[PDB]
Design a protein around this ligand. Structure first.
Ligand SMILES: CC(=O)Nc1ccc2c(C)cc(=O)n(C)c2c1
Length: 108
């Protein structure tokens, strides 16, 4: 039951991470890549941090997992213009994310 949730979330997270549009979101944004990012974005989130959180048994609920992954997308859209490649990646990966949640039957 806890380990079923873990398995499902691990599968979903791995699939999201393998996706071609995930490349902007794999690790914390580097100051070198985005100087002043960390003055703007108060709650940074990325897929590596999520992987660690998962391994650390933080995601005891679907809600917690969804909030972290959604934050990845909302940070991107707050920071970047709509026609930037980063914003485009976010919406493509978000579509994929939601298909994977639905496919899994993942529910509260
Ligand atoms: C690996 C990589 O190029 N990551 C980057 C670099 C720059 C940005 C910038 C500039 C914005 C942003 O939202 N993300 C997610 C980035 C990710």
């Amino acid at each position: 039951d806890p380990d079923q949730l873990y398995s499902t979330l691990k599968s979903i997270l791995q699939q999201v991470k393998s996706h071609q549009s995930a490349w902007p979101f794999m690790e914390p944004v580097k100051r070198t890549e985005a100087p002043g990012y960390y003055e703007v974005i108060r709650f940074p989130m990325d897929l590596k941090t999520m992987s660690e959180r998962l391994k650390n048994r933080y995601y005891v609920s679907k809600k917690l997992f969804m909030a972290d992954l959604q934050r990845v997308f909302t940070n991107c859209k707050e920071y970047n213009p709509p026609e930037s490649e980063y914003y485009k990646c976010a919406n493509i990966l978000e579509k994929f994310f939601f298909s994977k949640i639905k496919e899994a039957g993942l529910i509260d």
